[PDB]
């Protein structure tokens, strides 16, 4: 939480902050192995207007705490997933 | 636990969740997450040893014997972990990140990149973000003109922030 600082933890973990003191980078060699709806409709319509199909639109709903939407769709033969909250 | 010990716990939890969504042996995983209070997206690309080919995550049920329901339910848990990673910032009285790059290798190397761009009010869509991400991360150009132009709009937008 210091500005433009790099710091290394006891465990070897390296952290880098920006001018506002926000963490921007982390290094670890140690791993143990209107809004959203509008944002979504806007890009859909732009794809359609460019002559691209938006296929297989489905939603899963955890209902009524916010209602949770898991939205899915395919555009270039590629399925994308998105999460939207309603509260 | 210190702040960095909590972050390490969830790094490990995110890494192992992704790894169990991959039904074959992988070498590297590039993960991108865009999350704010109203929702978000989490995608990743993985490589296999012997090849540099990128394998998109939702192609896993289309190519392997794993059900879309099981895959998506795992994705749901993975999202929750990233939201947990984000809440840790909130609890440290830190400004929460809006994007997290999460790259790791099977040997255990992990590199994380946080950013704080107000993406939702930028009004750029999910695929636009993903195409911009892919142009900067790897060398990948979109192939339609609308898509290419959208990446250019995002580049100029970010430089001028």
Numbering used by the authors:
A (entry chain B): 470 to 502, 557 to 587, 592 to 614
B (entry chain A): 1 to 161
Can I see the authors' text?
The crystal structures were determined at resolutions of 2.30 Å for the nuclease domain of EsaD (residues 440–614) and 2.60 Å for the EsaG-EsaD (residues 450–614, hereafter referred as EsaDc) complex, respectively. However, the toxin, EsaD, undergoes significant conformational changes during the complex formation. The central 6-stranded β-sheet of EsaDc is split into two independent fragments: the N-terminal fragment (NF) consists of β1-3, which merges with the central β-sheet of EsaG through β4’ of EsaG and β3 of EsaDc; In the C-terminal fragment, αB from the ββα-metal finger and β6-8 interact with EsaG from the other side of the central β-sheet of EsaG. We could not trace the Mg2+ ion in the catalytic center, the long loop flanking the N-terminus of NF (Residues 450–468) and part of the ββα-metal finger motif, including αA to the finger loop (Residues 504–556). Noticeably, the N-terminus and C-terminus of the missing ββα-metal finger motif locate on two opposite sides of EsaG, with a linear distance of about 44 Å. These observations indicated that the separation of NF and CF of EsaDc by EsaG may stretch the originally folded ββα-metal finger motif to make it become a disordered loop and stride across such a long distance, thus abolishing the DNase activity of EsaDc. All the secondary structure elements of EsaDc are involved in the direct association with EsaG, mainly through hydrogen bonds, salt bridges and hydrophobic packing interactions. The CF binding is contributed collectively by αB and β6-8 of EsaDc, burying a solvent-accessible surface area of 3825 Å2, which is much larger than that of the 2461 Å2 in the NF binding site. Even though there is only one EsaDc-EsaG complex in the asymmetric unit, gel-filtration experiments showed that the complex was eluted at a volume corresponding to a molecular weight of 80 KD, close to that of two EsaDc-EsaG dimers. The results showed that strong signal of cross-linked product was generated only by EsaGQ69C in the presence of EsaDc, suggesting that two EsaDc-EsaG dimers form a tetramer through the CFs.
